[PDB]
Symmetry: D2
Subunit: 342 residues, 4 copies
C-alpha cells in the first residue's frame, strides 16, 4: 500500500540507482572535480541550450536559500508568493542564508504571481525604511499544482526589468511543468527571463541533491565558496551528480514526470465531478487539490489512505510520484466515490 502524501516519500528510480552503482567503481577526486560532475554539467548545458553554470547542493531548502542569497544583499528584499515554499516550508532558511533579506509576499492568483501583484509590492516602498526589492522568486510547477506558461513568465520578467529585479525559479517540480507543456527547458527558463533555476532531483527519483543552474554567469561568481561556507559541498560529489546523468541521458526525467502527471489527471478525472467535491485548482502537474467534507476522516480511517489535509480542513491534497500505480489511483477514486454517494 503506497500513498499520496507527497513525492518526497517515493524511492530512488532505476536510472538514478544505476548511475550511482556505476559511479561507485574506483577512486575519484572530491568536491566537484570528477568526471561524473562534468558529464552532468554537459548534459545540463545541452538540455537548456546554453552555457549555464551548474552547482549541486544537498536539498531544495539550501538550494533555494543559497540562490537567493547570491542575488541580493541582506539589506535588499525578495518578492515571493504566499504559498511559496521559501515562505512556508523552510523554517526561515532563506533569512538565515541571506543574513536577513526580508521575504515580501505578493498576491497570487492560481498559485501564481502576476506583474500587477509584484509592482504593487515593489513600488509601495522605494524608501530606505524598507529593504529595497531586488529579486522575484517563482515556483514552477507551483506549490498548488499549477504551471506558469512561457508568456506568463515573460510578462513577469518584464516587470522585473521595469523594476530592477533578478528572477529566481524554484523548480523543485520543474519536470512536471516540462512534461505538461510542449516546451523545452530553455523556453521555460532563460528564454523567458529566468536568471537562476533550482532544479529538483530528489522528488523525481533521487536519494539526495538538487542542481542549481545560473543562466547569467556574472551572478554565479564565487558561488562555490558560498556553498562550501554554507555546508553544502559534497565531498563524494559523484553521488549527487551521477543520478543526473542517469535521468538526463535519454529523457527518463521527463518520462517520470509525465507518469506522475498522468496519475494525478486520472485521479481528478475520476472524482472531481462528484457532489460535494470541488477541484481547488486545475491539475497542471502531479497534485490534486480537493475540497471535500468529513469524508476525509472517512477516507483516512477507511483504509490508511495517507494524504495531506489543509488547515482549510474541508480540503485535501493528493500527490502522485514517478512510482505511483494507476491501479492505486483507481482504488483511491473508488473509495472516494463510495464514501460520497452511498
Amino acid at each position: 500500500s503506497q500513498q499520496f502524501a507527497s513525492d518526497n516519500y517515493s524511492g530512488i528510480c532505476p536510472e538514478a540507482w544505476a548511475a550511482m552503482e556505476k559511479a561507485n567503481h574506483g577512486h575519484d577526486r572530491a568536491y566537484g572535480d570528477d568526471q561524473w560532475t562534468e558529464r552532468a554539467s554537459e548534459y545540463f548545458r545541452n538540455l537548456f541550450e546554453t552555457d549555464c553554470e551548474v552547482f549541486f547542493a544537498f536539498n531544495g531548502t539550501a538550494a533555494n536559500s543559497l540562490a537567493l542569497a547570491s542575488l541580493c544583499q541582506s539589506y535588499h528584499s525578495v518578492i515571493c508568493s504566499e504559498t511559496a515554499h521559501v515562505e512556508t516550508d523552510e523554517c526561515g532558511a532563506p533569512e538565515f542564508f541571506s543574513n536577513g533579506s526580508k521575504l515580501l509576499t505578493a498576491a497570487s492568483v492560481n498559485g501564481k504571481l502576476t506583474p500587477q501583484s509584484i509592482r504593487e509590492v515593489a513600488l509601495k516602498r522605494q524608501d530606505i525604511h524598507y529593504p529595497k526589492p531586488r529579486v522575484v522568486t517563482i515556483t514552477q510547477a507551483t506549490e498548488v499544482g499549477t504551471v506558469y506558461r512561457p508568456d506568463e513568465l515573460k510578462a513577469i520578467s518584464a516587470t522585473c526589468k521595469e523594476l530592477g529585479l533578478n528572477l529566481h525559479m524554484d523548480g523543485a517540480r520543474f519536470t512536471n511543468a516540462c512534461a505538461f507543456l510542449g516546451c523545452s527547458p530553455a523556453e521555460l527558463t532563460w528564454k523567458a527571463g529566468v536568471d537562476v533555476l533550482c532544479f529538483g532531483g530528489t522528488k523525481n527519483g533521487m536519494a539526495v541533491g538538487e542542481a542549481i543552474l545560473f543562466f547569467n554567469r556574472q551572478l554565479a561568481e564565487d558561488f562555490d565558496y558560498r556553498c562550501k561556507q554554507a555546508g553544502q559541498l559534497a565531498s563524494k560529489m559523484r553521488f549527487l551528480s551521477a543520478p543526473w546523468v542517469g535521468l538526463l541521458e535519454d529523457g527518463a526525467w521527463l518520462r517520470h514526470g509525465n507518469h506522475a502527471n498522468h496519475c494525478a489527471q486520472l485521479l481528478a478525472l475520476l472524482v472531481s465531478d462528484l457532489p460535494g467535491v470541488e477541484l481547488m485548482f486545475p491539475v497542471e502537474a502531479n497534485g490534486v487539490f480537493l475540497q471535500m467534507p468529513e469524508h476525509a476522516i472517512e477516507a483516512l480511517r477507511a483504509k490508511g489512505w495517507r494524504f495531506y489535509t489543509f488547515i482549510g480542513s474541508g480540503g485535501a491534497r493528493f500527490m502522485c510520484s514517478w512510482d505511483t500505480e494507476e491501479e492505486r489511483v483507481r482504488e483511491l477514486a473508488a473509495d472516494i466515490r463510495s464514501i460520497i454517494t452511498a
Copy 2:
C-alpha cells in the same frame, strides 16, 4: 515662523533637561562603556521609577534596541509575532532579521493598531510544525504607530496568552512616555505588572540627541546582553552622554511634562478640526499624533506655505505629529488653514 512642521517627533531638538545633564556630565574624566557614576545613577532612577530591580542597558537608537531585545528572546529558528504596522516590520530596513540571523516576523491582525490575544493565538496555533519557525516572542508598540494606547487590562490579556503559549513579550516603547502621560498609570503598571518582559524606552523622540534605554524586567533573559550589544556595535565609549540625559529627564518628572505637552498639542488639533465636514479622525488621539481622512486637499494644506507632514501611500489620509517643542500657536495656525480650505 517656522522650522517646525508636523512630520515627525524625530526632528525636535535636545530638551533643556537633557542638555543640562550632558553639560554637567562634561565636567571631568570618567570611565567608559558603562562604568561611570552617570550610568549607575540613571539605572537607579529606572529601578525607582519602575519600582523594581530591572536590569538597564543603553543603545544608540530604537532600531538596534528593538532588534537587540528581540534577538535575545529567541533563536534564529524561532519566530516573532508583530502587528502589520509595527516599526520592526515596516521601518527598520530588515534590522530585526539581521540582528537575529533569520528569525521570521509573523504579522498578526490589528484592531485599532493593536494586537489581541485572539490574533496572537491564531498565528501561533497554525505554526507548531517544523516547516515554520516556532513562535517564541510577541512584540507590541506602546503607544502604537497609529497613536493608540494599550490599557493595562489589554496588556494583561496579551501577557496571559503569551504565558500560555510559552511566548516572551517585548514592548517597543518609542513613545512609551506618551502612553504613560495619557493614561496616568505608573510605568510599572504599563510594563511588568502586566507581564512585559523587556521594554525599549525611547529617549531620542522625547528630547534627547541619541540613545534608547533597554529595561529587562525578567532578568534570566538578560544574561550577557552587554556582550550582545558590544558585538553589535551598540556600546558607547562615552556612555555618560547616553545615560546622563536620563537623569535629566527622570529626576523630577520632565519626561512626562514633555510627553503631556506633545499629547495636548495633538489633542488640540483634533478638537479644532474633527468636527469639520469631510474630515474623519481615523484613530483616537491617545498619544502625540493625529490621523485624518481628508480629500485631495492634502495638496491644499501641503502647498499652503508648505505644511510638512506624512500622507501614507494612501490617497486621502494624513498624519500630523507633535513633539515636546511644538508651539500651540503653530497648531492653531495649522487647524485654521485646514478649516479655511475645507469651507472654501
Copy 3:
C-alpha cells in the same frame, strides 16, 4: 586504481550499499520519521551505552558547525587547536553558522590540546573586549593522525567543567580512534566528558551524511529546527540513516577502520628505517606523515602517486581508506625505497 590523497575519495562500502538497497523497497515517511532512522538511533544508543539524542546531517563541515553553534552564542568563543578542521578546512563555515563566534586557537602538542593550553587561552580574556570562551572542540582522531586517550580526555574534561566550557568532539575519524585503542565508544566520549560527537560516516564508507550524538539531551533542545533552517534536513532520511544500520549491526564500522589503520601502520613500518625519511607523528589512525626530501617529486607527479604535501617542503601525508588494498601500500613503500636508496 587507488591513491593516498584522502579517505574522501573512496566509495560506498558494501554493508552501506546493501542497507540503501533494502531501504529503497517501498515508501517511507519523510524528514526522519521512518523505521530506518529509528533503527539507526537504537544502534547508536546500544553502541554508546546511553540514551543519546541522534541527528543526521549531510556532511562534517555543517555537522561540526551546527553542533558548535548550538553550544554557545555568537558573542561567545570556541577554543580549538591550530590544525583543527573548523579552523583550516571549512571556508569559515563555523562563523557563518554561529553568526560570528570567534575561533580561538590554543597551543597543540602532537595535534592535541592540553588542559594547560586551554587554560591559557580562556583566562587571558575574561573582559568584554573578547568573546567569552564557552566551548572546547577537539578532533578524534586528530588531523595529524594522533589519538586522545581516555585519560587525556578526562583531564581536558575536568578543565572544561571547572571553566564552564562544553566539550565537542569532531569524530570525522572516530572509527580509527576506537579501532586503534580498543576502548568502548562510551569510554572515548561521554564517560570522559564529551557532550557532543560528530561521528563521520562519509569517510568510513558512506555516500553522504554524518551522525551527531548529544550525550546531554538538554543541549539537543530544538536541534532539529536548527538543522532544518540551516538546510541540513534530508527529505529521504532513510538514505542517510540506513547505511548506519548496515555499518553498526555486526561491527563493520570497526573492521573497516582497523583495515585502514593496518594499511597505514604497514606503510610506516616499511619505510621508517630509511635514512632520509622521518615519521612526523605516531601512526595512530589511517594517515602517515613523512618528512622526506623534495624528491617527493619522484614519488608524486612522476610515477603518478597522489598524496598531499604539507606546507613544509617535502612534507607528505599518505591517507588510507576502508578500500585500500595492502598491495598498493607495499607498492608505494617499494617506490619510496627506489627513490631514496639510489
Copy 4:
C-alpha cells in the same frame, strides 16, 4: 582633579564640538542625514581631503570598521589584519557578526604595522576553497601601539593590495594623531597612498559620540546607507553627529587637539625614558607612551592616584594623552616615576 592616563576615550567633549552641537540645537530639521549640518560636514570633509569622497556617520568605531569591512568583501572572503588590530582584539567579534562570517586572518607585524611581505605571506597560502579567499587589508593609523605608517609604507601596502586584488581599509580611530605628527595632508595619508575607505574617529578627539566613514572609491559605497540602516547605525538626529565635525574642521581645531595630545605624550616620554630599568617599548609617534617598567610600578598605581592600563602583567605599562591633558599633570606623573625609581 579627575584627570588620568588610561585612555583618550575618557576625555570630554571639546569646546568646538560643544559649540557646534549648541548651534545645531535651534529648530526642527529633517532626520537621517537630510540636513544642513550633515551637508556642511560633508563639504568640509571633501575640501580637507581634496577629493569628492562619499561621507557617512556611524555611532562608534566598532560599528564603523565592522560595516566598512563588511561592504568590502563577502562573508566567504577574508580580511587580513595585524596581530594588534582593534578589529581582532577589542570588538567582541563584531567584524564577524556584521560580515556573517568573514574570517579575520592575522599577518605578522613589526611595530604594530603590517608590511607588504606579511600581507603577501597570508594571501598566497590561502588559495583553495578550504580557505576563505583574502579580499581586504585593514591597517590602523595611528596604530594600537602608538606608531604611524609613513606615506611610503602606505604606498607599498597599496601596491601589494592592487597586485593581489585586495581593497584597503584604514581604521583612523587616531587618524588625527598621525596627521599631526607627520605634517602630511589628509589626502597624502589616505587616497593618494591607495586607501579605499577611512574610518575617521571623532569620539577619541573630543566628541560625545560618532565616527565618520569616508569612501574615496565611490563605487565601493553603493547602498552603504542601507547597510547602516539595517545594522542599527543610522542616527535619527544626524545633525548631532555631523555638526561636531563642522566645529572640528572649520579652522584647524582637530589637528590642534591632536598635536596637543602628541606633545603631551612626547613630554612624558622625554622626562622618563632616560631612567634605568625604564624603556619605551615603541616610538612615540602619536599620543601613547608604552613603558616597560618594574612591578613596583604598583606604587605609581597604588595609592598615588594614577590610572593607566597595566600590560598582561606586570612588565608593560601604557599611558595615553588626550586633547584635554594638562602638561602639569604630565610633569607630575613623570616626577612620581622619577622618585619611585630613584630608590
